[PDB]
DNA sequence: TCCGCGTCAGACTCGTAGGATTATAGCATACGTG
DNA sequence: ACGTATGCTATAATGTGTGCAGTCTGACGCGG
């Protein structure tokens, strides 16, 4: 019979009212005073309609099965809101929010990274700009050659071109050969490998030693500042909170605590050896 | 996640999320519009086709093509055979504390020898050196060692011939057909890129000094030592399991 | 047969890391199996001891 | 002889005088391009043909139109030289003039209301360079030509698709260049079935009666007529003597007078020329005979009007009777036969469920859309659509061509469409091979493997730009308003720029040119896949395609081929092979007329070689006469055997048009294995050029050929004297003869100086002409990177050595001289080329200062203020080459941080750090620096020093062109002068500037100084502008990336040497890694102390069968010997008499020495510039199978005073003490592969970790360890290593805790086991649980 | 073949010699190729159910 | 139960290389937080 | 005020299709 998702819907249209001048306005008076069947019917029959205009709206972002659904949702809202009063026909007033729905549709699923509506509204207009340039110049226009023809700013175009980059997707095979994807070679940001890990703990245990090599009075101030020992990595004028409630003093101790750990990094084989560093 | 050149780069598996959220949340908004049936069918039909797509997507129909006019990646396909979890992230590995390279001839050496370049035994025992230098106090810190072996100074030579000395070292050679494609030797440092391996094994991976590589491996645990002396030594394999047959044969 | 002498074992986790995989785990699912580990590629997969 | 080739003269063993001479090698490429761009006025080919296909398109109404009227290239934006280097696509502006024309509408066709007409731009389309290749985005690209099955008719059959009947089932399948596939088939039951499109089987009389054809036309088409008379009682029977042939008498067969046979008795060849001479016509037979015969056309009772029996229904008796009184006694059935004319379209119509014509065109709609309810028009427009409309559907020429070829029709060339005539006869044929005449074609004849090079290609490609422009433009026309709309507002240049783009780029076929090698170069410009899109797979690969057909004899090697899954797909062209104009290839054939071999060469197709029989190469001809021989060795219908003289019609040109370029380049290729042939060839290919070109001492001849065809040399166009030599350039002065009167006449040849390859390796053109030296035309003026005075030099001779060597040449290893690595002749120079990117991140720009945070003085020395490395500056792994800096953003100074940058201090700025070092482990020297920027952002000083150079030298090598271009215009204006007003030196009084002012009377000459008078002027004004052109790019502001500000380029030049791990090889594929670069101490050397370069193993030729190599060994030793001779007298400083005796002697020595060089002819000075080119080793030619014999290179070793065996006495160095016995010595040409262990080793203990799999990365690109995959596992699960494995399965691979912790553990010294669960299993739960399946670790 | 090669290494192949030993020598290494998956494959499935 | 036609499961193992799309109108009040 | 979203335009227009079609041996599972 017919296992085609596509051809089911297509055929279930192709067997729906097709209405007159006069018979659309006998069902959309009744339709805006809510006559139930009335709205099913209109609707019912213009899905034809919405089909032939998303065969020229495919190619862009979704499916042909995905713009019928949204295309759908045009002819309902034109169906929420016609005047049959009017001597006007419906078709024409129902193709303006067919068009309008579906390319409003496609520019929010189309990119990955959702694109509001405004910085895309814009870019395309420095695209249509592009082409008027392109057929004149015979060749593709700069991020300044855009710029010229609008009198507007550079790193506005040139942004604008930035957000147009598309992607490639991590799971793409790499030079017409399967190998291997990206992810097979994209490093992992975050963790680095043991050595970095063990930098840090050895690094950080050392000092632990050296703040119990120094003074009381000055491990207690030094720490609680940088915020090593303490809760919060507080300032000069903010260890008085503590007990040392001075702003000189705190400052003497802070350095006189660096100046005995200097000399502890020069006895230890560090200091010049871990500047580079 | 972003690329170095300003580009993004999405999993395939979003994009096919995109797919399934959209006509879910286009159901949500046609239930509430009381929409005719015929179309809530095909809105039902798409939901279906995504979901389908999503779990495993060259299956039930036309597997739904993307960018580069190739197949999305779907979920059971990162489960599913050779390019699954199982054989490709899992069952095999890459694997630290290795390095492959040309092999060469090492007619000097005894059996239970082999040449390993002194630049790549440098880099892979690189936590060896770090651990000796503690030790003998010419390291405080890790990130001394570092510079130390960065530096590639003289005495820094003298501990990494120090901590190989009683090591084994794995040498692997593709393809690994039967166990003796790998055997362990006792490293001898050599200066230069090339390997130099035992001719009388040579049978056993079928290594012919003709552009071959082979991957070393580092036995790092002391049962790993122990393990390559005991039973992966290429003294302790002589006769293939095969047959009760001596494999290691001049010619 | 070899394919299907390996595909027999009680062990679903050796079967679906062979081959067959979508059907392995369909079956191991509807029949809701708990594999208790006993061959090799079990506890290779979970970095166990062999 | 020429000058370039007194110089050094190649000693040629060739004996079959060439009559065809080795066409240009880059034929393909070339030619083909060139009839893409070829705008042909009416023969449409390439772009003219694309327009002429799609256009003229007109609306959805059909009311406005528009028309294609003539096209244009201009001249390239970006040449050649700045392409490359910039970055972008070498590409030429395509500008069509389209014409909008619009028809009145209730008017018939008012066609002259608005012509509007104007010109357009649409995409940029991908110049070819003379050598034949692509800039794409400054990347030399070289697109391969594609191997297809040839559009036409196609007849084969799958032995035993159903091995259960094991019946051979026949097909047919016409093949369209566009359209729809129309396939025919049989099936257990021999009933004919048409499968449009390979999609349902329909029964194939469906098809027929869709083109009006009534049950009783089908029949009458293909089945005979048996007539049937009832004549009074007696039922009688029209009989053709052939028709009861090899059946048997079911009935008494008796005639006028006489019964032939019993009944059950098998009707013979006699009984049936017994009734055909008898002349018998008219049988009685009985009525049971015909209950089973199939009545033809139908049959209405005369008196009612009914049908009595339908057409195509099986006879009965009462049937008979019913229509023996209905009035008709002159019944005609079917001619029904099961060992000749079968019986199948009958049978077919019984299953046949359709009925007229307009439900035949039911079910062919049903079948392709099928739900869809069919109208008259939906369905005969489908069908119409098909196979018969002049949109979708073209066979094309070559399709027509081999489709009438194949129904052996009248017509070469015909209709695009297929017509009624050409389906049934297609469907004849289909049945003819059934029946059994007629053979089905093979695929793997390369008459039916079609040859597609780019420009066709391109053309394709480019249809597709129109097509998508065709949607654009109807769509607009129609509902847009007619007179405002423009045509460019409805054309779009952005669908064609892609869709070619598209082609030059992400295609198989478009890959990046492999030019590590002139051999490489153009033995992949010669390149024929199968594979990519149109094409076959390895997936889908047989072996039958792979396997070498009797049909590539002459047009396609039978060893040029990769050894990978990819083996018998890909394949080199033959020498001297050439593509048919339809697109199958053609070999060089010599006529043979009347006997007489003539010199007239006919280029046989693939499809008439099989039909003439064709002698060999080897046969022997009488200087103009006929074969020697009575008897030839020769082939034919794809066989070889002995044929007579007469009998001959054909002959093999050369005896090298069998094999590639890759195979002609091996000498005694006649005595080496295929598989050792193909792998030296394939080697032959990755011999990377070395420092200093040396000449193959053991050649064939086709060196030259190879090095000036490539297009890698500089090669001069007009002959004269080299008026001025340079290293960087060559100018040189035109004979009077080929100088143009026009013009000056003095060339212009500015070589490519070193720069990178694609490999990353050296690139230099050499001056090999002396200052003031007589060029003739066509002659080498430049060598390139590895030629050597025009001959191809690919690696390097030396004395060899055959035998083994305490193992250090084991399996192929080798072991080569410290004295080869003293020369550093082995050692190959590696141009890496560095990028420097300033990207705009979020926080900010990035810029190009010496300000770089966390530095020493050290790192900024050989950086300028800029921040860019001086040019000259030596540089090593960890030196930075350009200082770059960007944003630091909210970065979390830690704790421990915060204090160690208020302890020792330097609070580094609120700028990040990521300034380009040289890579860790490079190290070479600076030869350039490039800088690109912008249009925007104010630039570094650095990047104004190099703007002032490029400037200030442009505005010199200018000054130089208008300077050199005046003396040559005015050095003809003094000899015109002289032609007439003679007068010398009063002439040249005063300045030249005052010269035009002079003339001369009425008279050509007075002509001809005006022309260079007004031609001085037109440089002088066109001097401003080419000056313009230079300055602007150089202030251009280079377009970049979206986000990238400025980008500078480094070039570094590493000299790397031969060490252990280096790969290098012969040409006869003898394999083999250095192992040991012994001292001169130890090596091997002769009873005259002379050392060996290299010593290879014995053992690795008769295994190997190669032994090519020991012939190239003997004949390099006798060679070297004649120069070691010539190297002696030239020392001793003797004679001119006495080297031209002995040389003399050389020349003349073979049996029929092809080239006879008398030096009688040579002046003593042109012999003495020969005799020094000479005494480094007199070049042999030894054909590829016309090579020279033992006797020939033993007669030479006599010369050479060297031992006829080739085997000389050897002392060991080590010791002193001789070897117990002689070794083979002398000079193979041996190569230095690209594989460099540099290249290759690597190491790793810990470093980047993979993103999901959180196992490390892959590869010494990326720093990843060597994967240890499940093979390597169960190795370990053998042995018993448990911890081994495990220790490999987490700690070295995922396990995150493991890692870190066995780092820790490691440093401490406790190599302590400590697992805990690989992270890519944990991933593997969640994504068994995001199928919906509940996985959860069910605990003890 | 019906014709095998008559010639040897040291005498030289003719031009046909050497086309009718590529006949053997392309099949010989296209099998080295392709068939090696099918053995290579073996090891893989005896593997499993051992 | 049996025989033809459909889907579905495999196809060796390690190394190296390099980079590009079309377009979603066009403009005016509604909805969300410093 | 700034960013995001929501809305309407009133000639008539109302059933889609686009695109690769030499894998192969072996094994079942739904109809017929
Ligand atoms: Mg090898
Ligand atoms: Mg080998």
Redesign the pocket.
């Given at each position: 019979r017919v296992l085609?998702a596509?051809?089911l819907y297509?055929?279930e249209?192709?067997?729906?009212?097709?209405?007159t001048?006069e018979e659309?306005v006998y069902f959309a008076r009744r339709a805006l005073r809510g006559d139930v069947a009335s709205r099913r019917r209109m609707i019912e029959?213009?899905?034809?309609?919405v089909?032939?205009i998303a065969?020229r709206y495919?190619?862009?972002?979704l499916a042909?099965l995905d713009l019928i659904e949204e295309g759908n949702l045009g002819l309902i809202?034109?169906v929420?809101?016609?005047?049959?009063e009017?001597?006007?026909?419906?078709?024409?007033?129902?193709?303006?929010?067919i068009?309008?729905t579906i390319?409003?549709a496609?520019?929010n699923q189309?990119?990955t990274i959702?694109?509001?509506?405004?910085?895309?509204?814009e870019?395309?207009?420095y695209?249509?700009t592009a082409?008027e340039l392109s057929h004149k110049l015979d060749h593709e226009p700069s991020a300044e050659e855009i710029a010229e023809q609008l009198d507007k700013p550079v790193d506005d175009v040139s942004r604008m071109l930035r957000l147009?980059?598309?992607?490639?997707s991590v799971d793409?095979?790499?030079?017409?050969?399967s190998?291997?994807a990206?992810l097979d070679?994209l490093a992992d940001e975050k963790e680095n490998g043991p050595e970095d890990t063990t930098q840090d703990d050895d690094m950080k245990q050392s000092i632990v030693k050296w703040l119990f090599e120094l003074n009381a009075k000055q491990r207690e101030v030094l720490a609680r500042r940088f915020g090593l020992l303490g809760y919060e990595a507080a300032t000069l004028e903010d260890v008085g909170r503590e007990i040392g409630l001075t702003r000189e003093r705190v400052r003497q101790i802070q350095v006189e605590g660096l100046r005995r750990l200097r000399e502890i990094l020069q006895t230890q084989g560090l200091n010049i050896e871990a500047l580079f560093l | 996640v972003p690329?170095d050149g300003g580009?993004f780069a999405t999993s395939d598996l979003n994009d096919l999320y995109r797919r399934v959220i959209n006509r879910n949340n286009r159901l949500k908004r046609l239930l509430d519009l009381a929409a005719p049936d015929i179309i809530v069918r095909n809105e039902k039909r798409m939901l279906q086709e995504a979901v389908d797509a999503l779990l495993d997507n060259g299956?039930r129909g036309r597997a739904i093509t993307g960018?580069?006019?190739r197949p999305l990646k779907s979920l059971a396909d990162m489960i599913?055979?050779?390019q699954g979890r199982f054989?490709q992230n899992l069952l095999?590995k890459?694997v630290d504390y290795s390095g492959?390279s040309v092999i060469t001839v090492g007619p000097y050496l005894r059996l239970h020898q082999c040449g390993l370049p002194k630049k790549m035994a440098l880099e892979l025992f690189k936590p060896f050196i770090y651990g000796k230098l503690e030790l003998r106090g010419l390291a405080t810190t890790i990130k001394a060692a570092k510079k130390m072996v960065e530096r590639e100074e003289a005495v820094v030579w003298d501990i990494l011939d120090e901590v190989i000395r009683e090591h084994p070292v794995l040498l692997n050679r593709?393809?690994?057909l039967h166990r003796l494609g790998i055997q362990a030797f006792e490293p001898v440092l050599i200066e230069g890129k090339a390997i130099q391996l035992h001719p009388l094994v040579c049978a056993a991976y079928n290594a012919d000094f003709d552009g071959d590589?082979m991957?070393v491996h580092v036995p790092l645990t002391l049962e790993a030592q122990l393990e390559a002396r005991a039973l992966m030594m290429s003294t302790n394999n002589i006769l293939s399991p095969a047959n009760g047959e001596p494999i290691i044969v001049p010619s | 047969?070899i394919?299907?002498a390996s595909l027999a074992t009680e062990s679903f986790i050796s079967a679906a890391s062979?081959?067959?995989?979508?059907?392995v785990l369909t079956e191991a699912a509807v029949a809701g199996k708990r594999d208790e580990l006993r061959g090799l590629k079990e506890n290779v997969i979970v970095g166990r001891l062999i | 002889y020429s000058y370039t080739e007194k110089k050094r003269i190649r000693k040629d063993f060739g004996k079959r005088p060439q009559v065809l001479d080795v066409p240009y090698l880059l034929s393909i490429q070339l030619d083909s391009f060139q009839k893409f761009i070829e705008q042909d006025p009416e023969g449409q080919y390439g772009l003219e043909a694309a327009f002429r296909s799609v256009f003229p398109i007109q609306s959805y109404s059909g009311n406005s139109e528009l028309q294609y009227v003539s096209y244009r290239l201009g001249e390239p934006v970006f040449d050649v030289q700045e392409c490359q280097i910039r970055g972008v696509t070498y590409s030429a502006p395509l500008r069509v003039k389209l014409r909008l024309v619009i028809y009145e509408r209730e008017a018939p066709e008012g066609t002259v209301k608005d012509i509007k007409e104007q010109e357009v731009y649409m995409g940029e389309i991908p110049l070819m360079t003379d050598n034949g290749t692509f800039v794409?985005?400054?990347?030399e690209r070289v697109i391969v030509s594609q191997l297809h099955?040839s559009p036409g008719v196609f007849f084969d059959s799958d032995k035993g698709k159903?091995h259960?009947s094991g019946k051979v089932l026949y097909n047919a399948?016409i093949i369209?260049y566009r359209?729809?596939?129309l396939d025919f088939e049989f099936?257990?039951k021999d009933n004919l079935f048409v499968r449009?499109?390979?999609?349902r089987?329909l029964p194939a009389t469906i098809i027929l009666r869709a083109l009006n054809y009534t049950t009783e036309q089908i029949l009458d088409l293909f089945f005979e007529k048996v007539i049937f008379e009832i004549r009074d009682n007696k039922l009688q029977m029209e009989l053709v003597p052939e028709r009861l042939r090899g059946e048997t008498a079911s009935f008494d067969i008796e005639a006028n007078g006489k019964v032939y046979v019993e009944k059950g008795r098998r009707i013979t060849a006699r009984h049936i020329r017994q009734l055909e001479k008898d002349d018998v016509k008219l049988i009685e037979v009985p009525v049971e005979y015909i209950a089973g015969k199939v009545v033809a056309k139908d049959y209405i009772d005369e008196s009612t009007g009914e049908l009595i029996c339908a057409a195509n229904m099986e006879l009965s008796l009462d049937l008979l009777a019913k229509l023996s009184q209905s009035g008709h006694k002159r019944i005609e059935t079917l001619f029904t036969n099961d060992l000749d004319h079968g019986p199948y379209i009958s049978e077919t119509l019984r299953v046949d469920p359709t009925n007229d014509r307009l439900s035949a065109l039911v079910e062919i709609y049903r079948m392709m859309?099928?739900?869809?309810?069919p109208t008259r028009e939906?369905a005969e427009?489908?069908f119409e659509?098909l196979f018969f409309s002049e949109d979708?559907y073209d066979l094309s020429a070559v399709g027509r061509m081999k489709f009438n070829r194949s129904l052996l029709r009248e017509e070469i060339e015909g209709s695009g469409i297929l017509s009624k005539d050409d389906i049934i006869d297609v469907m004849k044929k289909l049945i003819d091979i059934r029946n059994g005449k007629g053979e089905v074609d093979?695929?793997?004849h390369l008459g039916n493997?079609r040859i597609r090079s780019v420009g066709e290609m391109a053309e394709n490609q480019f249809r597709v730009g129109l097509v998508r422009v065709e949607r654009?433009v109807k769509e607009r026309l129609s509902?847009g308003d007619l007179d405002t709309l423009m045509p460019q507002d409805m054309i779009?240049a952005?669908?064609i720029?892609?869709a070619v783009?598209?082609f030059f780029?992400?295609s198989q076929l478009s890959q990046?040119m492999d030019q590590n090698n002139p051999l490489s170069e153009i033995t992949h410009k010669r390149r024929i896949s199968?594979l990519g899109?149109?094409?076959?797979?390895r997936?889908?690969?047989?072996f039958?395609?792979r396997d070498v057909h009797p049909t590539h004899y002459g047009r396609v090697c039978p060893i040029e081929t990769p050894e990978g899954?990819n083996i018998g797909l890909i394949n080199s062209l033959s020498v001297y092979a050439q593509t048919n104009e339809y697109g199958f290839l053609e070999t060089p054939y010599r006529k043979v007329t009347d006997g007489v071999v003539t010199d007239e060469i006919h280029y046989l197709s693939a499809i008439e070689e099989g039909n003439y029989v064709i002698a060999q190469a080897n046969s022997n001809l009488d200087e103009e006469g006929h074969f020697v021989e009575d008897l030839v060795t020769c082939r034919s219908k794809g066989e070889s055997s002995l044929f007579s003289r007469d009998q001959v019609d054909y002959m093999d040109v050369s005896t090298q048009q069998v094999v590639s370029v890759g195979a002609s380049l091996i000498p005694f290729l006649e005595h080496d294995d295929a598989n050792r042939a193909l792998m030296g060839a394939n080697m032959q290919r990755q011999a990377v050029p070395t420092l200093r070109a040396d000449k193959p001492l053991v050649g064939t001849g086709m060196e030259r050929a190879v090095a000036v065809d490539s297009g890698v040399t500089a090669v001069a166009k007009r002959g004269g004297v080299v008026q001025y030599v340079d290293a960087s350039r060559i100018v040189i002065k035109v004979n009077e003869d080929e100088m143009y009167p026009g013009e000056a006449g003095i060339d212009i040849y500015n070589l490519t100086k070193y720069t990178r390859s694609?490999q990353?390796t050296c690139i230099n053109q050499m001056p090999c002409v002396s200052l003031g030296e007589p060029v003739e035309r066509g002659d080498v003026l430049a060598d390139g990177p590895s030629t050597d005075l025009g001959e191809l030099a690919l690696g390097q001779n030396m004395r060899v050595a055959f035998m083994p060597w305490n193992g250090y040449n084991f399996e192929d290893s080798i072991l080569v001289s410290e004295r080869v690595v003293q020369e550093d002749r082995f050692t190959t120079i590696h141009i890496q080329e560095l990028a420097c990117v300033s990207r705009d991140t979020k926080l900010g720009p990035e810029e190009i200062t010496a300000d770089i945070p966390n530095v020493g003085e050290a790192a900024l020395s050989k950086l300028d203020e800029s921040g860019i490395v001086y040019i000259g500056a030596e540089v090593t792994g960890g030196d930075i080459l350009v200082g770059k800096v960007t944003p630091k953003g909210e970065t979390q100074l830690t704790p421990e941080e915060k204090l160690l940058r208020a302890i020792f201090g330097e609070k580094a700025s609120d700028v990040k750090d990521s300034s380009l070092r040289v890579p860790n482990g490079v190290s070479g020297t600076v030869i350039d620096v490039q800088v690109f920027t912008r249009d925007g952002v104010e630039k570094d000083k650095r990047a104004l020093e190099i703007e002032e150079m490029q400037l200030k030298q442009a505005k010199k090598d200018l000054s130089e062109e208008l300077q050199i271009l005046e003396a040559g215009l005015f050095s003809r204006i003094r000899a015109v002068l002289v032609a007439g007003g003679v007068e010398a030196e009063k002439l040249d009084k005063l300045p030249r500037d005052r010269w035009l002012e002079l003339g001369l009377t009425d008279e050509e000459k007075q002509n001809q100084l005006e022309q260079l008078a007004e031609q001085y002027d037109e440089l002088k004004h066109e001097f401003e502008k080419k000056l313009e052109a230079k300055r602007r790019k150089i202030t251009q502001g280079d377009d970049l990336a979206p986000g990238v500000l400025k980008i500078v380029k480094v070039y570094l030049a590493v000299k790397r040497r031969i060490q252990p791990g280096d790969k290098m090889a012969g040409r006869h594929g003898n394999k083999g890694v250095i192992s040991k670069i012994n001292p001169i101490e130890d090596m091997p050397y002769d009873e005259n102390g002379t050392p060996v370069d290299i010593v290879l193993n014995p053992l690795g030729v008769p295994s190997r069968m190669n032994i090519g190599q020991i012939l190239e060994t003997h004949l390099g030793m006798a060679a070297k010997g004649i120069g070691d001779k010539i190297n002696a007298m030239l020392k001793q400083q003797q004679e001119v008499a006495k080297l031209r005796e002995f040389i003399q002697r050389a020349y003349d020595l073979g049996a029929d020495v092809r080239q006879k060089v008398d030096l009688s002819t040579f002046s003593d000075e042109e012999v003495m510039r020969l005799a020094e080119n000479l005494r480094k080793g007199m070049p042999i030619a030894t054909p590829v199978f016309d090579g020279a014999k033992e006797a020939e290179i033993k007669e030479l070793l006599k010369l050479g005073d060297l031992p006829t065996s080739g085997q000389i006495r050897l002392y060991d160095g080590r010791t002193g003490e001789q070897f117990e016995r002689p070794v083979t010595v002398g000079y193979m040409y041996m190569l230095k592969l690209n594989?460099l262990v540099d290249?290759?080793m690597?190491a790793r203990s810990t470093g980047s970790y993979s993103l999901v799999t959180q196992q490390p990365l892959?590869?010494?690109?990326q720093f990843?360890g060597?994967?240890?995959?499940?093979?390597?596992v169960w190795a370990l699960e053998a042995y018993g290593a448990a911890y081994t494995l495990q220790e490999m399965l987490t700690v070295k691979s995922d396990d995150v805790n493991g890692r870190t912790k066995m780092y820790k553990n490691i440093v401490d010294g406790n190599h302590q086991m400590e697992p805990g669960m690989p992270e890519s299993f944990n991933v593997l739960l969640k994504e068994i649980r995001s199928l919906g399946i509940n996985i959860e670790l069910e605990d003890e | 073949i019906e014709t095998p090669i008559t010639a040897n290494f040291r005498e030289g192949l003719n031009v046909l010699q050497y086309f009718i030993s590529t006949h053997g020598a392309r099949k010989g290494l296209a099998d080295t190729?392709?068939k090696?998956?099918?053995?290579?494959?073996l090891?893989?499935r005896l593997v499993d159910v051992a």
């Open positions: 085609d596509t051809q297509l055929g249209i192709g067997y729906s009212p097709l209405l001048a659309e029959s213009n899905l034809r309609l089909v032939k065969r495919g190619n862009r972002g042909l809202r034109a929420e809101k016609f005047d049959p009017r001597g006007f026909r419906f078709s024409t007033y129902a193709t303006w929010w068009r309008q390319e409003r496609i520019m189309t990119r959702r694109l509001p509506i405004h910085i895309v509204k870019l395309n207009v695209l249509r082409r147009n980059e598309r992607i490639t793409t095979p790499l030079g017409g050969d190998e291997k990206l070679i | 690329l580009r299956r960018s580069n006019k599913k055979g050779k054989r095999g890459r492959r593709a393809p690994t590589q991957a | 047969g394919t299907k062979f081959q067959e995989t979508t059907r | 794409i985005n400054g990347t099955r159903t259960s399948r369209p359209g729809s596939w099936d257990p449009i499109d390979r999609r089987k859309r099928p739900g869809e309810p939906a427009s489908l659509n979708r093979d695929i793997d493997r654009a509902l779009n952005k669908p720029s892609a783009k598209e780029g992400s990046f199968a899109p149109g094409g076959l797979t997936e889908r690969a047989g039958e395609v899954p694609n990353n594989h290249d290759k690597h892959g590869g010494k690109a990843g060597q994967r240890f995959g499940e093979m390597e | 190729a392709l090696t998956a099918n053995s290579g494959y090891t893989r």
